[PDB]
Amino acid sequence: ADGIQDKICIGYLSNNSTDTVDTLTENGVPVTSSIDLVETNHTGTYCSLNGVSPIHLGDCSFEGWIVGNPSCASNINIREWSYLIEDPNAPHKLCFPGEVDNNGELRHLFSGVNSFSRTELIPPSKWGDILEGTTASCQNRGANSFYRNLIWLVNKLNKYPVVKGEYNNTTGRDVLVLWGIHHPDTEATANKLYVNKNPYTLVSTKEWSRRYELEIGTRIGDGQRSWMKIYWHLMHPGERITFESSGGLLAPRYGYIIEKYGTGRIFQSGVRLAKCNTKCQTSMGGINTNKTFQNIERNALGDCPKYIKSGQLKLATGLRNVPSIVERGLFGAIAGFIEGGWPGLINGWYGFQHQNEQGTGIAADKTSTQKAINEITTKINNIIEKMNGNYDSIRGEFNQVEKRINMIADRVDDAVTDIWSYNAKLLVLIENDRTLDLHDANVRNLHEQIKRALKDNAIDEGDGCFSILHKCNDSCMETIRNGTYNHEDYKEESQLKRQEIEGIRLVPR
Amino acid sequence: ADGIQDKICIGYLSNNSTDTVDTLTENGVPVTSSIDLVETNHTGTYCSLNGVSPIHLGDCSFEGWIVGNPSCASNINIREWSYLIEDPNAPHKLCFPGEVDNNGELRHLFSGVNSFSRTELIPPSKWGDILEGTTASCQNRGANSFYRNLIWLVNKLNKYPVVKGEYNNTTGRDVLVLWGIHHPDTEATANKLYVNKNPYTLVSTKEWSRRYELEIGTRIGDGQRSWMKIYWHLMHPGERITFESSGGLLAPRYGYIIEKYGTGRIFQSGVRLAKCNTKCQTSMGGINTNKTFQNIERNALGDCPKYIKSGQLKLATGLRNVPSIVERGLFGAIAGFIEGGWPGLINGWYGFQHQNEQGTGIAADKTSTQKAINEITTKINNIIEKMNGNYDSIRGEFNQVEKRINMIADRVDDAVTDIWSYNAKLLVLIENDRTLDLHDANVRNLHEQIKRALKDNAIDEGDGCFSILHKCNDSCMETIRNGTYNHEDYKEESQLKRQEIEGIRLVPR
Amino acid sequence: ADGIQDKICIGYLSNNSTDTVDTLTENGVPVTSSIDLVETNHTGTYCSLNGVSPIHLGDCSFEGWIVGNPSCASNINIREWSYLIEDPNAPHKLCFPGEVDNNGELRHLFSGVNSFSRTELIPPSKWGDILEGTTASCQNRGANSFYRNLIWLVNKLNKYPVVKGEYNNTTGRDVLVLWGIHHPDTEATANKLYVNKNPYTLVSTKEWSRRYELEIGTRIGDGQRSWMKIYWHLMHPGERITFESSGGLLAPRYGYIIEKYGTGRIFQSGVRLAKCNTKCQTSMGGINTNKTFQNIERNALGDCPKYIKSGQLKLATGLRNVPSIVERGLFGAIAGFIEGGWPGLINGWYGFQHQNEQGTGIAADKTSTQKAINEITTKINNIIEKMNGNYDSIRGEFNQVEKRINMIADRVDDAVTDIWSYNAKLLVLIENDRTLDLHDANVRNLHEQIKRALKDNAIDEGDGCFSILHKCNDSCMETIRNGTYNHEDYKEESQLKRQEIEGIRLVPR
Numbered sequence A, B, C: 001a002d003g004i005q006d007k008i009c010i011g012y013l014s015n016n017s018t019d020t021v022d023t024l025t026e027n028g029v030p031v032t033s034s035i036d037l038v039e040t041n042h043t044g045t046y047c048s049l050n051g052v053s054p055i056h057l058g059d060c061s062f063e064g065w066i067v068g069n070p071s072c073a074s075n076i077n078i079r080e081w082s083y084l085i086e087d088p089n090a091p092h093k094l095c096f097p098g099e100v101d102n103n104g105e106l107r108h109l110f111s112g113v114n115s116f117s118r119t120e121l122i123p124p125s126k127w128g129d130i131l132e133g134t135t136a137s138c139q140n141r142g143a144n145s146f147y148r149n150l151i152w153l154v155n156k157l158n159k160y161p162v163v164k165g166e167y168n169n170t171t172g173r174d175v176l177v178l179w180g181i182h183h184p185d186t187e188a189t190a191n192k193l194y195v196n197k198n199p200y201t202l203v204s205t206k207e208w209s210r211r212y213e214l215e216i217g218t219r220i221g222d223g224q225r226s227w228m229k230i231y232w233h234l235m236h237p238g239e240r241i242t243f244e245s246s247g248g249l250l251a252p253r254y255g256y257i258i259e260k261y262g263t264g265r266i267f268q269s270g271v272r273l274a275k276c277n278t279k280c281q282t283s284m285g286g287i288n289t290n291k292t293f294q295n296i297e298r299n300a301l302g303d304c305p306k307y308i309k310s311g312q313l314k315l316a317t318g319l320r321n322v323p324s325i326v327e328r329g330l331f332g333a334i335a336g337f338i339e340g341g342w343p344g345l346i347n348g349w350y351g352f353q354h355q356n357e358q359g360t361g362i363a364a365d366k367t368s369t370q371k372a373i374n375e376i377t378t379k380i381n382n383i384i385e386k387m388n389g390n391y392d393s394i395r396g397e398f399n400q401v402e403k404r405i406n407m408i409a410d411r412v413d414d415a416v417t418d419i420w421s422y423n424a425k426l427l428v429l430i431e432n433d434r435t436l437d438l439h440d441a442n443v444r445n446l447h448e449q450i451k452r453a454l455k456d457n458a459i460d461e462g463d464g465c466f467s468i469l470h471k472c473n474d475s476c477m478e479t480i481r482n483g484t485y486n487h488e489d490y491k492e493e494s495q496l497k498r499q500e501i502e503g504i505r506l507v508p509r
């Protein structure tokens, strides 16, 4: 074949790429590397959350558990929980027919509590010459009993003196106090249990006072015609609460001393509780990741990636080194192998390819490729580390009659997810174009430094290569790659060669 | 005239620019085309919403309609609605002076409902040896009557036996049950209507229980001194509800089986209900658009563009082809005509203008321009189609005494709008710079490919044009345009011409 | 030193930088100037808010103030407030033991009130033949007294006739109406004060009706064993309210006409009230800035920068004029002085540096720099001026029992702040890359312009400079700078010089 000038090319060195990204302007762009911004894996189980175990309520509802239905696990030894797991259809709810007042708010406050201790508020003896009602509805191991937290005060010897009890919160923390009223199905039952005419109960702190009378009538709860209503109050430190009754009162025995609460979630049973720990629990499973987005489950609690409605989002890190870059004046070469291999993050080289009489080869330019790795590392770290806010669900606990406020809370969570989801999808598409164009600008900048060093000693072939107008052996090549080439040294030889080339004619003149 | 070299210019072809955009860095930039991102057109009427008609409550309030004020249109035949339209001063509210308990919640749940069916819960005969009170306050076809949904139980022959009724929700769906209590103005009226001393009403499900006694005294509603309180509960499947009364109960007759509810809005009357269908209904009119933003009305319901506080936002799609582009080394030509017309999205071509002895002309480069159309299309489709979230108002239904929560919910809607408003205004400005810059970059790329083809056979005039150093007739120009021109074919002629040009002296040596 | 050709260099003229910023891809980039996007300075005091004074409740709680505890300053003369400052341990609350119903809602609506006036609802005479109860718990002006806004109706001559009174809202505005019920500690006290058996109060509008009976028993408030409960209603124009009692009513005397309410905040005492005015009040102090973000305090009210969780964010405006730009083909010079000084926005100039046999000098290119100032100004103004939404806290007032809605509101506030926080941090990083890159493109364009004018009469040195192939005295330099230089003028000279330099040999041939 005809003789050819020695040649040096500046551009990309990499292997063949398989994995593509999308950019705002282009689809299915092959690049040498990328990262996934979205977490899709999870444990598929309920785990501890940041070292703190949840409580699985098993066969019991929250209400049954918190009031102390003796068919439920006692909470005498509980110290903390991160979240609760509850069976919507748990069999053991309130053992004796009744309801809990404001129980959506109570669920929300006990969804997680970081410091919890059950405490005896008032000893059973304080109420005086009374006895304690028990019921087959609320059995303890086959014996008739009652909620662990309350005392059903009833007549002794057919008398019911006025009873009184009080509790001062001296614990230095918040204390949950529970009490109730039993409403008889008949006047006969009321007369029998409580004796006194027009029984009343009066409960007060220095901030509020409530008075309760009996609401007589037949109800349709299972296993009883009468009915109980349960009430609660969270006392701040220094509060005082007093109870007085001539009949009806289900007296407070045990309360809960609680600190750092409302910090959990009531998740639904089904998914299994496993021995494991995660920094982000969702209803599908626990997530352990350094990714800042997840597309698994909107219902999430803890140190979480933001949920987004998205498929995977691949953030380009490497090079667009495909055959067609030549149409933009860029050079690239493909090679299964180099030496010291390819850099991890960008997979991985700006560099040179040469040809002279001694042969061919490729060589990386470490200094420029390092500035690129730094720029890419800086970009990725800024996108990731600046997302340092709070991204678990915006969510509350609500009961059956709180549909409006439940709906609006869930909508605001959805609206916040919509802003994040669009922003994430666009940032990635935009930044992918900017990263690919950044690699191009970098190699073009290297190409211009070479152009500048070669001056009139080389023809710019417009494809990222230079044809050198003198003999350029491996030592010459290495002076070009290492920035020490001096065009003066070869001026005589180069002007003679340029003259010779200028005179060649494809069709004879 | 003096001799001139044949010439080819690479750049923009288009007609005159009638369309200006703003960019992050410049105002009033003329471009050959853009698209509007914000919808400003609407029907000015209330329409069907994605195939589902609303209900115009006409001269009735929601309360009147829902309890069945006989002056209001029966809902016996209604099966569904997308939203409600209500006159805030409708004359027909509760016909007999009264109130509906928790009516904000009730409004919110009935704002729209996908499957609705009225149902007779309990036959009027079940209540026993009672009669039914009617009233001139509630006339039906001129006759004294009562709400369709309730039965005013009163004595028969100066007897009022205890009445009982119950309803088992066996429907597989949610059942709204309504009931009330009448509170006499005097003990005399209470004795006359209900007979029994201290009459009571007891209503209960297995989940809750309420007991109601009469609250006697004169009220100020129009046409009556007495007063009614209406109450409701939404039963889930399997629930059971019982009624018992010795006087005062306004007994349940008709309830409503409902599925997929709380999905609507209660819009205010004034704007007219037209025969039409839209995917997004606002209080101003229906919006039928593929735009993703609207600036018409914040109160919007359905598959909606997100409401933003903004003027129109023009996204540039076409070319910055103005005379001043030459200051940045770019060529452009303005033509009222080109064979085959201009492309739709960019309203302009990348391409060529030429001059030689045969004459002058312009020609589109189809390959480059097509690549641009793909890029702009992909860009637009991303910006638009990635916004597939839920952008109608974050809003609820609240009554007069629910001001705080209403205020808060509205502020959240507004803050969400403030996020999207800024994001939209800025994205457009930013993306317009990118788009106009991308077009430049694309024609600079063409110009460079030609530069590379012509090599030393053309002088780069720095204005987008090359002065060709040989005769280049139409055939030769087509080889340049179609990428087959071979500089070697004209090497002798081009060298001779260059030598001649270098020898010329404007001012004689 | 050897003879050198005359030279002109195109690029940046400025002083040493001393100012750094970060970009998405690089940290600590020295720039000639930047601006701070985040406000960090505040008054450290409570000020008037946009000309409207707050109210410092001093040693009274809001309840105590609004009901008119005589220990609290009278609000007879108040016309408005922008916000309230309250001691959470204020000693003067309700002077007689009691509670205010729905007091969190009340706090929220009175948090700031733009038009307020106290008004006499019902003259004391209306209630008929009763006397006014007073108490040492509520002393005023040396004597037992009672709340300013209420009258404790008690018997006269051991009779308590049924009292009645009404108020019609004909103010055209909303009117806050307060009433109460006294609950005796004993039957003996009830029979003594009110005489009648089973005393009742009936309070009704045309929209609702409430009946209150006495709740007898001993409470634990300081200084009294009985208890009062206080109620309110906000009447819209046209509303009518009626009161009737046979014992217990604390009758309404003064109410409040209000307009544009719910607009404030209840800040906590501590920070002192000062004679100042600002547009944005935070719990840390007043903020008077045109910046659109602040990192001072999340609890902020008014015309506010958005609170973000961020350090300072420095937006690049000036030039990246550092020695290493020459590696990217760019020229810059550093100088202390230039005729007329540096432009303030970018600090300072695109321009020229020359050298010939008359000496060396720099000169600004005013036309290209002004374009850059316009571009940056336009950028800044878009970023700032398009943030014209509402950015103070998403917040409400709640009482102690309203923990869940308070937590959820505060969470929404936080999640909105999290969006703006990430967005502001990224946007500054991204725009800084784009600003410095824009300045680079601008000077490269000026350089290309000069390149085009010099044509073959100059050697492009690839560092921003041109070696001119002829003598170019200062007049010649000036024709280059002002775009009148004509290469034809120096063609003969330049070709002779080029041919000379081509023949020179560093090592003799």
Ligand SMILES: *[C@@H]1O[C@H](CO)[C@@H](O[C@@H]2O[C@H](CO)[C@@H](O)[C@H](O)[C@H]2NC(C)=O)[C@H](O)[C@H]1NC(C)=O
Residues within 6 Å of the ligand: A166, A167, A168, A240
């Ligand atoms: C709860 O606290 C109160 C104080 O608020 C206690 O009542 C005081 O009891 C002391 C004697 O221990 C008396 O000297 C005071 O006169 C009482 N003060 C008041 C204001 O009533 C009460 O004993 C404490 N209750 C419990 C269960 O410990």
Ligand SMILES: *[C@@H]1O[C@H](CO)[C@@H](O[C@@H]2O[C@H](CO)[C@@H](O)[C@H](O)[C@H]2NC(C)=O)[C@H](O)[C@H]1NC(C)=O
Residues within 6 Å of the ligand: B166, B167, B168
């Ligand atoms: C509502 O459901 C209850 C419970 O299924 C029905 O009461 C049952 O009625 C049958 C027929 O008389 C008796 O044999 C059962 O013993 C009853 N069960 C209970 C638990 O009482 C009741 O009839 C249903 N009511 C209506 C109106 O459908």
Ligand SMILES: *[C@@H]1O[C@H](CO)[C@@H](O[C@@H]2O[C@H](CO)[C@@H](O)[C@H](O)[C@H]2NC(C)=O)[C@H](O)[C@H]1NC(C)=O
Residues within 6 Å of the ligand: C166, C167, C168, C240
């Ligand atoms: C409040 O308004 C009511 C309703 O307008 C007034 O009651 C009317 O008083 C007029 C004038 O004396 C009578 O002729 C009407 O018959 C009344 N109508 C009704 C329905 O009551 C009442 O006087 C007003 N109250 C006050 C204190 O101004």
Ligand SMILES: *[C@@H]1O[C@H](CO)[C@@H](O)[C@H](O)[C@H]1NC(C)=O
Residues within 6 Å of the ligand: A475, A478, A479, A482, A484
């Ligand atoms: C550059 O390469 C030449 C040839 O290998 C070598 O002799 C010289 O030391 C190198 N200079 C630098 C700075 O590495």
Ligand SMILES: *[C@@H]1O[C@H](CO)[C@@H](O)[C@H](O)[C@H]1NC(C)=O
Residues within 6 Å of the ligand: B475, B476, B478, B479, B482, B484
């Ligand atoms: C390009 O134009 C030349 C000159 O007219 C023509 O003969 C040739 O076939 C064309 N080639 C292509 C690839 O269109």
Ligand SMILES: *[C@@H]1O[C@H](CO)[C@@H](O)[C@H](O)[C@H]1NC(C)=O
Residues within 6 Å of the ligand: C475, C478, C479, C482, C484
């Ligand atoms: C440019 O420079 C020349 C020489 O200094 C001067 O005479 C002339 O007026 C200038 N031209 C313009 C257009 O400013």
